[PDB]
Amino acid sequence: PELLTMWFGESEANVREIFDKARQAAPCVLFFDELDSIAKARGGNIGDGGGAADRVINQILTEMDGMSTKKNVFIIGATNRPDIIDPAILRPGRLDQLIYIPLPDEKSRVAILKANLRKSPVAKDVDLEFL
Amino acid sequence: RPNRLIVDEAINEDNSVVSLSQPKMDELQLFRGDTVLLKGKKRREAVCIVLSDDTCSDEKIRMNRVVRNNLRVRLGDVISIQPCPDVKYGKRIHVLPIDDTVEGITGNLFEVYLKPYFLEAYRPIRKGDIFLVRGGMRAVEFKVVETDPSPYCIVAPDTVIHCEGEPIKREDEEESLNEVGYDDIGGCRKQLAQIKEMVELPLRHPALFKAIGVKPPRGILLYGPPGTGKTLIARAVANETGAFFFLINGPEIMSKLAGESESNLRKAFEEAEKNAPAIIFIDELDAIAPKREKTHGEVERRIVSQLLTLMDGLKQRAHVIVMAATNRPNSIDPALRRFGRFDREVDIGIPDATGRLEILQIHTKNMKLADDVDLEQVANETHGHVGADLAALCSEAALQAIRKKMDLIDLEDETIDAEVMNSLAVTMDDFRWALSQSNPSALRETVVEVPQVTWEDIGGLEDVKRELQELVQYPVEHPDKFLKFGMTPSKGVLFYGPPGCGKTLLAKAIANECQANFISIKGPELLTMWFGESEANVREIFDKARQAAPCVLFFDELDSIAKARGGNIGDGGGAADRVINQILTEMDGMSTKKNVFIIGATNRPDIIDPAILRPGRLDQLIYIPLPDEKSRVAILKANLRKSPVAKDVDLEFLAKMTNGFSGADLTEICQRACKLAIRESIESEIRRERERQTNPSAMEVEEDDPVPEIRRDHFEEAMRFARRSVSDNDIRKYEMFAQTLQQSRGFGSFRFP
Ligand SMILES: Nc1ncnc2c1ncn2[C@@H]1O[C@H](COP(=O)(O)OP(=O)(O)OP(=O)(O)O)[C@@H](O)[C@H]1O
Ligand SMILES: Nc1ncnc2c1ncn2[C@@H]1O[C@H](COP(=O)(O)OP(=O)(O)O)[C@@H](O)[C@H]1O
Prior knowledge:
The structure is cut from a larger assembly and holds 2 copies of chain A.
Chain A: H1 2-7, H2 13-24, E1 28-33, H3 36-42, H4 50-66, E2 73-78, H5 107-117
Parallel strand pairs in A: 1-2
The structure holds adenosine-5'-triphosphate (ATP) and adenosine-5'-diphosphate (ADP).
PDB class: membrane protein
Keywords: erad, membrane protein
Entry title: The cryo-EM structure of human ERAD retro-translocation complex
C-alpha cells in the first residue's frame, strides 16, 4: 500500500534514502510485501500509469546492481502471483531463489491452533487433529 | 477551621443568597433563611441571606459575582463566614448610581428599576455593599455609602430610600460586574473544563507549584473559525483567575516599521515577565507565522526567528503562560509545535442548537422579550451561525423592533425616556424579519455532532441491530472481558445491499445510541478530493476523528472509487488509487486504543476492490435485506407518525399491494399522498375565496379539510402509479454476491467434533 502511495510521485529519491537507511543498519534484513501489486498497476483494470512502475523497477534494479558484496543485508520479496511480475527481475545478481508455500496440513494446523490458543483459553473439549 | 468554604458560582439570580449545606448551617449557629456576615480581602463585611439549597458540597459555598466583588475575591477563593443572624431592619437608604452607569438615560431608577428589584426581596444591604439591578437593556450598580443602622440593614416595608441627588462618583475599588466571566460564555462546557484543569493550578498556587518543581505546560493553542469568542474566552479566564492579561495583535505589530516589531515584541515579553504571573495573548499569529514556502520575503523569517528565540528563553522558572489563537493548525510553521513550544492544542467547535440557545439566552438576557418567545425554534432555524452571528442577529432584531415605533414617540435628539425603552419588546415577527435578512457564516465547513436518529425510525433488522450493539457498545461497555481473553475488537464494519434501505440512518442511530460524534463522508466530496489536495484532507480528517474519540467515522458511496476507476472511464484511476492508498495507510496507522469506528457503505459489493478484504481492514460485511410485507407497515408508521393521519382504511392491505419496495419509494408514496391532500385543501380554499370575491364574508373557517388526514382516494392515486425502485435482476446480483461469499465460506454445513 505505501509502495503504491509512493508510486504516485516520488519514485527515485525515496528508494535511495530507504536503501541508504537499510545500509546504515547493517546487518539487517529487508522485506517486501506484495511486490506484484506494482505489476497490478501494470496489469489491471487501468494499465495506463506504467511509467511510474517503470521508474520503480528501474530504481530497484539499479540499487540491486549497486549492492556491494561486502554489505550483509538479505532482501526478501513476497508475491502472490509470480506470473504477472516482470521476469527481468528473475536473473542472477537479483532475486533467484523461489520457494513455494504449501497449505497447512493436519499437524501443521494442529501446531497453528495450539499457538493461537496460547493466548488465554483452552480447548480441552475437542480433537484438534480431527478438526 | 471547619467554617471557611471554597467559593463557587451561585446559580440563583438573587444577589444576596448563598447556598449552604445543613451541617455547616448548624455548626455556624445560623437560622433558616437568615443572614450571614462574610469577610474577605481587607476584612470587608457583606451580609447575605442564607439560601435553602444543599446542592453544592459542604466544603463549597455558592456565591455569585456580586458578592465576590463585595468580598474582593475571585473564583476558587475562600470566604470568612461568621455568625451574625441578628441583622437589623432598614431605617433609611442612601444609595446613588455610579456616574458611568446611567449615562444617556435621564430617568428615575427608584420606581422603574429599584421598586421591582426590592419588591419582596428583603436583600440585606450593608454600608459599603454593592448591589446591581438589571433592567430594560442595561445593568445599574449601587453602593450603600452610609445607612442606618451601621453597617447593615434589612430591606423591610418601613423603608426610606433617598434616590434623589447627583449620581455618586467612583469609589476607587472597581468591583465592576460589567466585565466578562465564566458565566458569560456558553456552548463550550468541555473546553472550559479542560482549560480550567490545565490552567488553574499554576495560577492558584504559583509558589507551591514551584516548590513542586515540575515543568508546567507553556504552549497552548485554540484553533477554530473566527468570531467564536477566543479572545473573549482568554479575557474572561484571565480576569476571573486574577492575572495581568496582555494582548498582542499581528497586523498592529508586524507593520509598525522595518524591524521595530522585534523591539515591540521583546518589550512586551520583558514587561510581562516583570509584573506578576500573567498570560500573554497573541491573535492571528498566522499573519506573522506563515508556511516556510509562503515566506516569500526575508524580514518575515527574521521576525519568526526572533519570536522563537524570545519565547524559548522561558527556562523552567516562568510564571507567565503564553496563549495564542489562530485558525486551523495548518498554515502555522511546524517547528512551533515542538516541546517547550506550543504543544497543547484545543479546538473550539461550532455549538449545536442547544449551544445556540444558551448563546441567545446570555445575549437576550437584558432585552425585554415579548410573549412570542421561540428561542428553541430560532436555534433550530439558525444552523451555520456563531456567537457573533447570534449577537448581531439579536441586536438588529432589537433595532427592527424599536424602529417600528419612531413616529409615535417624540424622537427629538436630546434624551430618551426609560419608560419608552422599557415598553418595547422583541416579537417573534421581529425575529422572522431579522432571519429573513441574514447571512450564515459556517456554510462550507464540515460539522461534527452527535446525531439524533433513534431506533424506532427504522423498522425491522433487530437482530442486526443487536449484532452492531455487540460490536460497538460492548467493547467499551466490557473491555474487561476483552482483556481477560486478550482479544482485540473488530476495527470496522462494512454494509452492502439495495439502496434506499437507510444504511446511513442505521449508522446515525447507532452513533446516537453510543453517544458519540458523527462524521459524514460524501462520494462527490471524495472525488473532489481526488484531484489536487488529496493526502492532506485525509490526514486532517483522520486526525480530527482520532482527537474527538469516541466518534463514528462514516463513509458513503465507497464504491464510487470503482465507479470512475473501473468501467469505461479508466482515467481518474490514478487519483482514485492515491486516495485509496492514503485511506489504507491512515486506517492501518490507527490504534485500537482510540475509540473510533470506520464504517463503509455501498450498494455495489461486487465492484468493490478486494484490497480491503483483508484482516485488520473492513472484514465484517453485512447484507441489508429489502423489507417487504412483515414489518413494512411499522416502517410506514415510522414515516407516518410524523403527521396525523386519523382515518385510514387499512395499512396491512397497503403493504399487500406493494412488494419489494424500499424505504425510499414508500416515503415517496407518503409524500405524494400528502401532496394530493395539500392540493385538495388549497383548491378548496381557493374555491372559498372564488366564492367570496363577489360575496360578503362567507365564514372562512376551518371547514377546508385542513386536518392531517389522508383519505383512501389519495392512497389509491398513489398506488395507481408507483414504480418499483429495485429491479429483480439487481436482487439476482445481490444473491450472486451472497453465494460468492458462501463459496468463500465453502463450508457452512454441520460436522460433529
Ligand atoms: N460563546 C459565546 N458566548 C458569548 N458571546 C460570544 C460567544 N461567541 C462569540 N460571542 C460574541 O461574539 C463576539 C466575538 O468577539 P471577538 O472578535 O473577540 O471573538 P473571537 O472569536 O475571539 O475573534 P477573533 O477571530 O478576532 O479572535 C463578541 O461580541 C462576543 O460576545
Ligand atoms: N423509517 C425508515 N426505515 C427504513 N429506511 C428508511 C426510513 N426512512 C427513510 N429510509 C431510507 O433511508 C434512505 C436514505 O439513506 P441513504 O444513505 O440514501 O440510503 P441508501 O444509500 O441505501 O439509499 C432513503 O432512501 C430511505 O429509503
